[PDB]
Design a binder for this molecule. Structure first.
Ligand code: HEA
Ligand code: HEA
Ligand SMILES: CCCCC/C=C\C/C=C/C/C=C\C/C=C\CCCC(=O)O[C@H](COC(=O)CCCCCCCCCCCCCCCCC)COP(=O)(O)OCCN
Ligand SMILES: CCCCCC/C=C\CCCCCCCCCC(=O)O[C@H](COC(=O)CCCCCCCCCCCCCCC)COP(=O)(O)OC[C@@H](O)CO
Ligand SMILES: CCCCCCCCCCO[C@@H]1O[C@H](CO)[C@@H](O[C@H]2O[C@H](CO)[C@@H](O)[C@H](O)[C@H]2O)[C@H](O)[C@H]1O
Ligand code: CUA
Ligand SMILES: [O-][O-]
Ligand SMILES: [Cu+2]
Ligand SMILES: [Mg+2]
Ligand code: NA
Ligand SMILES: [Zn+2]
Lengths: 57, 93, 105, 72, 227, 51, 82, 259, 46, 144, 43, 79, 514
């Protein structure tokens, strides 16, 4: 392997105004939206599960 | 063998700025406590700033637990309201 | 530590410095009123004459106000201090807060 | 007529000195009062009750009143 | 039992409870004194126009603020611990009674000679007899001989409970798998009430304790009659 | 110049005290609240035991 | 202890310890544990009430098998499986 | 703009996604324990690993690639890791407290003895002793890794770090085998309770520490570490030594003295 | 950058005191109301 | 006079009895006549009139010690409004008794209490101080 | 502390509205539940 | 023999509030003595003191549970 | 922009604001639960039901007030707002981890509310003792949801503790030593260390309860050789450090409030105040068993824990007398914040003295699990902690918002609250001494009067809480913007204006060493 740190330092110091969690490129946006969708969708599902568990069956 | 980079080769950003400035004996990012002068009007404490004002904390006597805080403005030297030692702002950068 | 006489002589000397500036006058009075005492008339006299050298009539009246305030409920302290200061008040033309109506709420 | 020179130093410390001693005096007054009106009162009440107390006579009065499950 | 508008402890029925009353009187006076002193000093600091706002030296006065409370704590600890160990003192009991906690009632066992055991349930409010006490009466009381040192053993067969009788200075937790011991000595006959003192479910408030103290002769005949 | 307290202090104090005493006295005595006071010096003991 | 090599603890010294002491010790323990391997005869089943606790069924399987159940050595509340 | 040496962090969604992942994992465990479903639990675990990956990814971006880790920022992270390990020590302390409470005072239900009647403990001189030599050896090899890194030796750093990881995996496989082979279970009273809960939480920490070392291994492969700046390795080394010391206490207390 | 100053360093608007009153009423009211309706929920089950 | 928000980093005026000489003058900008007054102040103060002396004081200071230390009638508003809301609380208690609380148990009926009281006296509840100690068993009445 | 005069003064009548609305937001929902307690207990 | 038993006396081995071991020990002691007396053709009456103490101290449900488990073969103590 | 600022925050001020909003909302929930308690006890009989629903309310009352109201307001709220400002730091050491500490709490609160909605709730008490909390007496998900709620709150405070300790130690000006930091900063660090050391023990205890309920472990089950008393040791080893975690930030704010409104530049006996807070924290780890005097422990152990508990009165007394010495000679400003602090000093002292009464294991036999204990801790919590929170809130509200409160309304609020809390809890001393047990939905007839008065007091407190909401509305409605603040020379947090800019101390303060 060769030292490619200088290329990453240039990429993540690029003056594009992007936050660090999105500065890697389009793949960061996809991984973020996958994470947030599962979190928000799972949270809504947990609220449904609470409603079901709150009454006898 | 080698193969491990050094800070001289690979440090970047603010870390490199601190490293290179310390190698010149400079402290632009306020890592060290400044040493006081005698604090007279003729020999005031010189407070660097990038703006025209900066908050000064004055420990009037050694081992005082109370710190005296005040804004030091550009212009004529100002005195600590508790002990009267003089401070003068030196803007640059 | 230091006697009452040494303390008063320190403050008399402090206010008697001929070229005392406005900052040192305020610093002196603001520090002095923190102590558990009403300042001796000789101290106030030196402070009032410092106001004269600084061409500051208003601070001289304020100093008389804070003498009365430091006395708290002891009503007899302020008339005594004014009595002892009357020659200085007449010499310098310093009107008391009462003569100026500044004791009225 | 001139006015006499009043005490001008340490008036706050003198007020504190006077009333801290005063509070100490009142504390002793309360301790004596409390020992007499509460502590000793409880001591004598229990001592007077049991000096000539008759537990069998007490029981018989309770039994005749019908309070017991085991003693009619 | 407690009476309406009661301010302090129920009247002592045991010598140990009598010691607790006297230690509480001794301690309550100190609590009254310190709180009054603090309240007064507060008003003292707030009722003068005189001022002193410069730096105050603290070392000398903090000797007073430390030695005096330390001495006071010692005058509390000494009688407190003396009562603590006299509670624990070796005594020679003449009878051992076990109580088992249940949801939601107490069962008692007298197994020194015969196998006497029974349950003790709260008298419901609708079934109280005129003059009986709401939430306090039981169907089967704990009959005990008066003026005799009794060993009580406390346990439980389900959740935690606590067997308490304030008149006698008694409170012993009822823990399953554990046999806790306390001593009981009543100076007088009568009825002495207590209530479960550990949260134990839906009827935690409704499983009281009633001790019936009678002469030995009546206790012996009562024990025989309950075989 | 007179502030709110100079203009209305006396009325607020008087009306507040009068309203507070009246409604608490009413609540304490007129709606059937059970205070359960001590029977000492107030209740005549009555026979309770039956056959 | 017994070794002396002090004055400079560095990469070479700690590799010396890794290959000269640490890994040989693992080899010896592996060897030792390898002679003492092999199954021991499982003991007779006694339905002790302080063992094989079941106060709520497990959330897997049939609710009666522990998570890493071994049929050879782990009996059920009713005894060993077959 | 700033003339201090500290790091102002970009606004980040990972705190929220991490907190929501904890909600999903805890409500998932409740769903699993009581309502016979693992769905919420799997979503929580997945979001938890996505949060941890992107969070620590950003920390590497902020430090290796952007240079925000000044000596003052490094010193703060040093305090943070030490304090975190301290809180982990107190967590295990509770389980050692539980163990000694039960074993020093064996109740009648156990037969009044320790080990309890019907419990046949593992031999502490067989695999438990082997596991002790494995973790002790990994403490030596990870120290060789550290000195190799400080002296600028890339090849031997990766050599020692790989050996340390292999030993960590070796311990996990040996423990997994010991779990299956054990004649006692987590349901075999307070002996099985203290044994598996304490060693199980330790085994989890071994897996966490091994993962941390693997992260440092691949970061070393990509030349992230300098000979002077490499706190990610140091934090992993501190955590690995913590894992080792906990085992030594487990071995002495539960495997040896408790046998 | 973000807005600064009074009424701008908060996640709720204070532009209109009556819209704010409704929001504070809903915010604090829902917290106070929640235990009463949970008690109602439990009583309505058994 | 006018103090601004962005002024927070500058020395400001305060009226404190324990800080009699503030960092700045109450009035900063002087008119033509006020400028002339300050020039006259450099001469003997005996030549100043009472109105001019008051004017010099009001330029340096905002309130006098008497003005800044004056009492107010705020306690009347505070105490009176506190009793109103405490009085309003009783309205909530009245509503609760009327609409929420049902009947209290039958053991509080007057006849039950009278019989319960005797039974407590029959078992000698609190006979040393608390209860039965206040009953006269010889005279069959409450001790006077 | 010194402060500016209110940029949007709240008159006594406006304070009466806010006070009443605030108290009613606390009292009405809880009052409704407590009023219907007997319906909840026996149904 | 030296009998007049009222209740179990103080035992210095078990001097604290927790009396679980006192009941457990005397239950063991009686049945260990009973087994010794039964096996070698003796009289169980020599075990009577242990019987009186454990019956005084032990909860009925403890004895009954321990009795069931001795008969079932699951009693964890050594007898 | 809104989501980036308030959901993705890395700013200590905004995060502190979120904590304050969260704690205020929780305070509404805790208040409603407290009224449901005293409504049940307001007259003899049963109002809601049997002890199950009652103790579910009691259990949630404690949890909400402690973990969701006091701790987020004092530590997460005032701590995040004031600590960086008081040391001239640009932010917390871990600003992004700081955001997760907050956002763990709404799910923690959701889990608590879920436990009371499913099955019959967790009617166990906030101590959650087994076997009542076990899977037999409390089958179902309620207790497990309660445990997980405590898990999330535990993680939140442990990470917050790591953040505060690191920030306070590492991010001061290079010339400022630890003995040049304000007392509130001291109180937060000491609180953070108690959190760091005690919560992991709690997390271990409740994890063992979780496995006992769901994995057939028997840590606390005698059938498997366990001991229910072991849980009590594990809980209370955290439990007492927790009550000192609840009061220590209050101690720090009181020091600042008393100093400020006495016109003083410094508190009396600074080093004595530091010594006392550190002594109180240390002693708080070796006294836990005074919550267990009736469980059947040896007399020698009961003699030690009685003695060790009482020592704590000495360092605490130093703080009380130093607060009085700070008042001595001051230019007293009778602000509403000062009134709260003066009420704190007296009422906390009363509650502290009744704690010393309970420290005596002999007397505690009769007082344990009675309302005398309830009287003790409500004086130090519902008057101590609460008044410190209210005093801090009215003192620093102009700094946080830039608007001023109505001082007359705030004084009226204090007057109503003072009457309400004392009418509520002072008669509970009588109920405790006379023998009324804790956690009862109903009581014998003799306890009627004091229960009636106590419940009437709680309604007065409700009126104060409702007035508080109006007072906050009136401040935001009127928009009286702050101009000048006194004593900025010894109160650094005010020196950047009201409110301070989003970024403060971008250029750090100048402090030389001389
Ligand atoms: C803010 C919370 C807080 C604080 C500060 C305290 C402070 C103290 N507490 Fe309290 N306590 C609780 C919250 C708190 N407590 C809670 C919540 C419970 C019950 C939990 C439950 O069961 O649910 C409890 C229960 C509790 C018990 C158990 C009673 C029982 O359950 O049977 C005991 C007994 O030792 C106790 C003691 C003390 C002591 C000695 C102090 C001391 O720190 C107080 C020291 C202060 C002073 C002493 C006053 C100031 C000192 C002076 C003015 C000097 C002069 C004084 C003397 C010379 C004595 N507490
Ligand atoms: C901090 C903790 C705290 C607080 C504040 C309170 C507040 C109150 N408590 Fe509570 N209580 C406990 C902690 C607390 N309690 C604990 C630990 C127990 C034991 C639980 C158990 O046994 O398991 C208990 C038990 C308890 C009982 C016993 C139940 C029983 O044993 O059967 C009772 C009954 O009278 C009671 C009453 C009250 C009352 C009337 C208040 C009232 O004073 C409420 C008054 C309102 C407030 C104090 C306002 C709240 C604060 C805010 C809204 C802040 C606002 C926000 C900003 C300013 C930003 N409490
Ligand atoms: C090296 C291998 C390690 C094991 C890997 C298995 C799963 C990993 C999970 C990690 C959980 C860590 C702690 C779990 C506690 C107990 C687990 C004990 C360790 C273990 O895995 O031991 C097994 C447990 O089984 C079982 O059900 C296990 C059931 C798992 C249920 C999960 C419960 C998780 C609870 C977490 C609570 C929160 C943790 C604390 C957070 C505090 C925050 C402040 C024993 O198996 P057995 O079938 O009895 O056979 C034995 C003889 N053949
Ligand atoms: C595997 C199956 C389930 C397991 C669950 C959890 C999974 C495992 C996670 C293991 C931990 C991985 C952590 C990766 C961290 C990478 C980021 C990193 O290491 O970041 C470093 C900073 O350290 C830092 O933040 C260090 C901070 C990291 C602390 C993490 C410590 C472990 C925490 C894990 C959670 C424990 C849970 C406890 C259970 C009770 C970067 O600084 P440097 O390297 O000095 O500077 C870069 C140089 O190039 C400059 O020249
Ligand atoms: C401790 C928490 C606070 C407790 C104290 C509450 C203070 C007073 C709140 C009043 O609440 C309202 O009371 C009405 C009665 O006065 C109820 O109307 C009820 O009664 C009316 C007349 O009887 C009917 O017209 C309505 O339909 C019926 O809902 C109404 O629902 C309820 O919201
Ligand atoms: Cu049994 Cu409470
Ligand atoms: O808890 O004290
Ligand atoms: Cu405690
Ligand atoms: Mg208890
Ligand atoms: Na009730
Ligand atoms: Zn200075």
């Amino acid at each position: 392997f060769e030292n490619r740190v200088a290329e990453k330092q240039k990429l993540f110091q690029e003056d594009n105004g992007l936050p660090v969690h999105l500065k890697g490129g389009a793949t960061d946006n996809i991984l973020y939206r996958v994470t947030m969708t599962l979190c928000l969708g799972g949270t809504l599902y947990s609220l449904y599960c609470l409603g079901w568990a709150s009454f006898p069956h | 063998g080698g193969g491990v980079p050094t800070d001289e080769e690979q440090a970047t950003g603010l870390e490199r700025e601190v490293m290179l400035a310390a190698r010149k004996g400079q402290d632009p990012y306020n890592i060290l406590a400044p040493k006081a002068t005698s604090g007279t009007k003729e020999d005031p404490n010189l407070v660097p700033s990038i703006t025209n004002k900066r908050i000064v904390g004055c420990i009037c006597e050694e081992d005082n637990s109370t710190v005296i805080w005040f804004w030091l403005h550009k212009g004529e030297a100002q005195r600590c309201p508790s002990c009267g030692t003089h401070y003068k702002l030196v803007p640059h950068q | 530590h230091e006697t009452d006489e040494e303390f008063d002589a320190r403050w008399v000397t402090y206010f008697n410095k001929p070229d005392i500036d406005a900052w040192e006058l305020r610093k002196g009075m603001n520090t002095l009123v923190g102590y558990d005492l009403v300042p001796e008339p000789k101290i106030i006299d030196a402070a009032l004459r410092a106001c004269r050298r600084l061409n500051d009539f208003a601070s001289a009246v304020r100093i008389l106000e804070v003498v009365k305030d430091k006395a708290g409920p002891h009503k007899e302290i302020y008339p005594y201090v004014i009595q002892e200061l009357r020659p200085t008040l007449n010499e310098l033309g310093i009107s008391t807060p009462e003569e100026l109506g500044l004791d009225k709420v | 007529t001139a006015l006499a020179k009043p005490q001008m130093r340490g008036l706050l410390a003198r007020r504190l000195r006077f009333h801290i001693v005063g509070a100490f005096m009142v504390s002793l007054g309360f301790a004596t009062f409390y020992k007499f009106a509460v502590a000793e009162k409880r001591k004598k009440a229990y001592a007077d009750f049991y000096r000539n107390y008759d537990s069998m006579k007490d029981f018989e009065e309770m039994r005749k009143a019908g309070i017991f499950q085991s003693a009619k | 039992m407690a009476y309406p508008m009661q301010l302090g402890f129920q009247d002592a029925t045991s010598p140990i409870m009598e010691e607790l009353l006297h230690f509480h009187d001794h301690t309550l006076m100190i609590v009254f004194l310190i709180s009054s002193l603090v309240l007064y000093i507060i008003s003292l600091m707030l009722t003068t126009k005189l001022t002193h706002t410069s730096t105050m030296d603290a070392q000398e006065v903090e000797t007073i603020w430390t030695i005096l409370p330390a001495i006071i704590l010692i005058l509390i600890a000494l009688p407190s611990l003396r009562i603590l160990y006299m509670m624990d003192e070796i005594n020679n009991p003449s009878l051992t009674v076990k109580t088992m906690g249940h949801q939601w009632y107490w069962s008692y066992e007298y197994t020194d000679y015969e196998d006497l055991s029974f349950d003790s349930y709260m008298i419901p409010t609708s079934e109280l007899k005129p003059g009986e006490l709401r939430l306090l009466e039981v169907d089967n009381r704990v009959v005990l001989p008066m003026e005799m040192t009794i060993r009580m053993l406390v346990s439980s067969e389900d959740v935690l409970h606590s067997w308490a009788v304030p008149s006698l200075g008694l409170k012993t937790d009822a823990i399953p798998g554990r046999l806790n011991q306390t001593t009981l000595m009543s100076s007088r006959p009568g009825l002495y009430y207590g209530q479960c003192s550990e949260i134990c479910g839906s009827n935690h408030s409704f499983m009281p304790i009633v001790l019936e103290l009678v002469p030995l002769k009546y206790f012996e005949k009562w024990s025989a009659s309950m075989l | 110049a007179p502030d709110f307290h100079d203009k209305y202090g006396n009325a607020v104090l008087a009306s507040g005290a009068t309203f507070c005493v009246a409604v608490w006295v009413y609540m304490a005595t007129q709606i059937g609240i059970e205070w359960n006071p001590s029977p000492v010096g107030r209740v005549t003991p009555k026979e309770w035991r039956e056959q | 202890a017994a070794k002396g090599d002090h004055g400079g603890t560095g990469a070479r010294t700690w590799r010396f310890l890794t290959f000269g002491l640490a890994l040989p010790s693992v080899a010896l323990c592996t060897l030792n544990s390898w002679l003492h391997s092999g199954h021991r005869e499982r003991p007779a089943f006694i339905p002790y009430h302080h063992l094989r606790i079941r106060t709520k069924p497990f959330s897997w399987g049939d609710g009666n098998h522990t998570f890493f159940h071994n049929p050879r050595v782990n009996p059920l509340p009713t005894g060993y499986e077959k | 703009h700033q003339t201090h040496a500290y790091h102002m962090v970009n606004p980040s969604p990972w705190p929220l996604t991490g907190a929501l992942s904890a909600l999903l994992m805890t409500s998932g465990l409740t769903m699993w324990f009581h309502f016979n479903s693992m769905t919420l639990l799997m979503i929580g675990l997945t979001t938890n690993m996505l949060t941890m990956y992107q969070w620590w990814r950003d920390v590497i971006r902020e430090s290796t690639f952007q240079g925000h880790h000044t000596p003052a920022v490094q010193k703060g992270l040093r305090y943070g890791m030490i304090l975190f390990i301290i809180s982990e020590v107190l967590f295990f302390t509770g389980f050692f407290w539980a163990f000694y409470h039960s074993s020093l005072a064996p109740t009648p239900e156990l037969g009044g003895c320790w080990p309890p009647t019907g419990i046949h403990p593992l031999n502490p001189l067989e695999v438990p002793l082997l596991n002790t030599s494995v973790l002790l050896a990994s403490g030596v090899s990870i120290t060789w890794a550290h000195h190799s890194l400080m002296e600028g030796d890339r090849k031997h750093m990766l050599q020692a770090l790989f050996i340390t990881i292999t030993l960590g995996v070796y311990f996990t496989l040996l423990q997994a085998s010991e779990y299956y082979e054990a004649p006692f279970t987590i349901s075999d009273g307070v002996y099985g309770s203290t044994f598996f809960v304490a060693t199980g939480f330790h085994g989890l920490h071994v897996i966490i520490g091994s993962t941390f070392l693997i992260v440092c291994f691949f970061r070393q492969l990509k030349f992230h570490f300098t000979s002077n700046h490499h706190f990610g390795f140091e934090a992993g080394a501190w955590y690995w030594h913590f894992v080792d010391v906990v085992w030594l206490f487990l071995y002495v207390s539960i495997y040896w003295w408790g046998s | 950058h973000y807005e600064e100053g009074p009424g701008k360093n908060i996640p709720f608007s204070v532009e209109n005191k009556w819209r704010l009153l409704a929001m504070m009423t809903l915010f604090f009211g829902s917290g106070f109301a929640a235990p009463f309706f949970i008690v109602r929920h439990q009583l309505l089950k058994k | 006079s006018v103090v601004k928000s962005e002024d927070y980093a500058l020395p400001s005026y305060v009226d404190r009895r324990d800080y009699p000489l503030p960092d700045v003058a109450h009035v900063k900008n002087l008119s033509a006549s006020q400028k002339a007054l300050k020039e006259k102040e450099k001469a003997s103060w005996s030549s100043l009139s009472i109105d001019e002396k008051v004017e010099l004081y009001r330029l340096k200071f905002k309130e006098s010690f008497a003005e800044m230390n004056r009492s107010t009638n705020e306690w009347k508003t505070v105490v009176g409004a506190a009793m109103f809301f405490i009085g309003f609380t009783a309205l909530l208690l009245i509503w609760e008794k009327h609409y929420v609380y049902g009947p209290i148990p039958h053991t509080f009926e007057e006849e039950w209490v009278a019989k319960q009281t005797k039974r407590m006296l029959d078992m000698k509840v609190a006979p040393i101080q608390g209860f039965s100690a206040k009953w006269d068993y010889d005279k069959n009445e409450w001790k006077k | 502390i010194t402060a500016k005069p209110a940029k949007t003064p709240t008159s006594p009548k406006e304070q009466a509205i806010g006070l009443s609305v605030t108290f009613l937001s606390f009292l009405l929902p809880a009052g409704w539940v407590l009023y219907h307690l007997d319906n909840y207990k026996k149904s | 023999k030296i009998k007049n038993y009222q209740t179990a006396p103080f035992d210095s081995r078990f001097p604290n509030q927790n009396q679980t071991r006192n009941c457990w020990q005397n239950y063991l002691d009686f049945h260990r003595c009973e087994k010794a007396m039964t096996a070698k053709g003796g009289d169980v009456s020599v075990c009577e003191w242990y019987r009186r103490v454990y019956k005084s101290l032990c909860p009925i449900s403890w004895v009954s549970t321990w009795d069931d488990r001795r008969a079932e073969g699951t009693f964890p103590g050594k007898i």
